[model samples]
Target: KVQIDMERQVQIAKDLLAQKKFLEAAKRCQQTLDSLPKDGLLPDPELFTIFAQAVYNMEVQNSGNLFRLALHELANFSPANEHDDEIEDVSQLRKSGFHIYFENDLYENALDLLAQALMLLGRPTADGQSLTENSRLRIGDVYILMGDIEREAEMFSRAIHHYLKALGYYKTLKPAEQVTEKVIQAEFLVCDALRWVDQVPAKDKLKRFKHAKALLEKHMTTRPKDSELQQARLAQIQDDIDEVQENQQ
Candidate 1:
């Protein structure tokens, strides 16, 4: 019966995932299979629910190295620099290509364009934000993609900076005080995604969660009946806190 207590066992599955204990969690989830024949027969999906947390749960087992993460981001950024003037036209082309790649989340090509923009940079305008002819949103989009890719490669720190840069671009956009909900949601999605990918210290993670929570609350004010956001919020909490405690032992 211990494995059949839905809430308790679901939380345990979450705990197992937090500790990167996937196989055991999956086994426990299987214990509920017999319930599938009753009524609508929707067995609890605990193990499947924990997959995302298990993926990021690995960061807690490992150490974070910002300098190394930065170096990895730079390694991707530096390849265009090596060819020198022979790649002049490459710059012009990539400046345009970056937007295309970034919109599709094709990070490799997005960064290729950013690198070309860097090469063509005649001088650092005192305002260093002048990296390319693209809009702040468009440029930041590439950097965000870079961050996303970096995090997938486990360079969490560099990924943090890239997300920060993307947020900066959002700030620099000069959008109205009452932004559209879609824009607001998209911006916060990036924030939430960063929270998921980073192994941020507890205090920092708490702060970021509170911020995301406030954003969600505001979202709920308009769509109070929204189950989707509520579900996502619970999932985030389960990953960031609920499950993580299991690993402390």
Candidate 2:
């Protein structure tokens, strides 16, 4: 059996991935992995991760299998990001790729790839810096993105749960500056989501609307007077408040 030029093949696969030629990259990755010497170590975690991402990007239904393969190698790679931060950077890139799926309106693929990217982020640093701690806003943003997708799917209950979870995280942010504009976004999502929650108990629904109104008003209070977007959002939330009050009576 002819051996694949491992380095050359990996470089080519990576180039194809950068070009978004996912099908060709995935095919080359599988070929390279299979061509490894039986006595040699398994393919590098990077190769597996890239292959999994490429397959998922192509919208393949069975991409989860490849994702698990990458995860297995990633786990076996030991101190994954101990000596190098590049692995974590790749994890971030994968998350961006996941968002591309979201932008394309492939809701299922978006969720799937997002979860996979988070898995790739793995865990805390050796000094005990938690990814969730150091990357709070990024995590919160993912929650918002997931909620956006759920909203598109018209699964309002699910969407609202995600938005609220994100809102809770943003509320816990310290130094206020870290909270960013996404906090307002999460609240607006809550407002939009509340409109669909009319099927829930009236008391619960009213409670949600009132809380959403409060959060929006709080965010709007902090905006500069010249900020037209915040002004428009304030008006929108007032409309939501009026509608919810009508339901109460």
Candidate 3:
């Protein structure tokens, strides 16, 4: 007779994670989570970590919402009804789990979970229109997350590569659509990555930062409706420029 328990599964998953068996670790979490009782208790964060990391491990390649308290996000998590429609999809629950992985600096695992979210939405088919497009946008988002991971890891060239992919995808988007935030994020990240490219001279870095600042400033001039969030982003670019200039001295 099998004596099944959540604690046992969680422990096994943790061990697998230690061994870098990402998929196995993730599966264990998913299986356990699915078996959870119908009671309305919040699931363990550790389980979320395990699942996100495992799903992330399925593909060995690839990579914050840092402002809000992360526990707040986890605190709000509730076990999902597997039978429910798209409105209360488990993918969204899994998608939000990546935030926890990211907050804990599990960058690679965070990436895997993002990819899993796409799978949850169902694989895009030839007949897929909005479905495929939205998935592509999400992949672009994954690229940005990869950029963030690589940049922090000091792999500047790799970071630039991911950021460029993100920017390229944003360009292919329909012109009629409102992609203001997406455009800002992709473009600014590319510039930021360039600024930190390894072996680049101080003068070159300064030039990159100034170029980025001009791009943001130009956008703001044309679109006054752009919010203060963008304005703060501009301020960040200026700070980089100021620091680069000081470096030149």
Candidate 4:
């Protein structure tokens, strides 16, 4: 009886998502999640994943309320003994929650959720001994997003701090998994944030721009397949260098 009802509800939610009725889908999933007995039955990851997807796509008033409910349910669903797959599902849910909160102008909530996701992967301060290459990449991605959020609030110093942290992860990736593009992006973000800091001298800004440009050029030589995109970015950085030089003059 419970199994049959659960399947029906999940099917309805899937149909709602397929029809692009995201709010309805989220509501259905949330109702099903709420109705489940919290004893021995494990919550369905697919159900939660669907809910997360709907929450991410939906735009409505008081959507944050829905997120709070979903997160509350997530906490209840988490068991004391966690398996690897269970941890991954929870981390993905948190990441989705972070995106929804971020888009809704809830920076603090977004950061809190993102921090939880990072912790699930491993401690960032420790060397990557326990962290997989994929985990390190995910951590770097989280840091990049964190930096972008800080930059959105015009906290240039804090933004740069996060970007550098991202760079540390990207640069130390195992040889087979080294992400040159991510490293370049973190470098570019650091240079971009430096432009807005009052304490950063113009000379230093110019130097950073030049350094980023050279790094991009070096990568471009090795991966010429994406020369068009890289060339456009190089042109943009060159313009910044020119502007800084003009300011100094």
TM-score of each: 0.42, 0.54, 0.48, 0.59
Two-way lDDT contest, 1 vs 4, winner:
4
Off by over 4 Å in 2: 1-105, 122-132, 178-180
Residue 121, candidate 4: alpha-carbon lDDT: 53
In every candidate, how many clashes are there? 0, 0, 1, 0
lDDT tens digits by residue: candidate 1, 1-249? 333556776787777766668545544444433332334333332322332233223333332445522323222211121222222342243211111331333333334434443333322345654434344445445455556556665566766666655555555454553323333443454445555443444444555555556656676666645558665864675466444454454
Scored by CA lDDT, what does every candidate get?
A: 0.45, 0.57, 0.57, 0.62
lDDT of 2 by residue, 142-230 (tens): 56766776666667777776676566556556645446466676767776776775555545555555665676667667775435876
Model 4 per-residue lDDT tens digits across residues 51-136? 64465555323443653012122112122122222123332333222224335544444354455445555433255345677767
Strongest candidate by lDDT: 4
Score candidate 4 by TM-score against the native: 0.59
RMSD of each: 19.8, 11.7, 14.3, 10.9
Encode model 3's per-residue lDDT on 80-119: one tens digit a residue. Answer: 2122121233334542322344344455555545445434
Ordered from best to worst TM-score, the candidate numbers read: 4, 2, 3, 1
Q: Where does candidate 3 stray beyond 4 Å? A: 1-29, 32-105, 112-132, 151-156, 193-197, 224-226, 246-249
> What ranking of all candidate models by lDDT puts the best one first?
4, 3, 2, 1
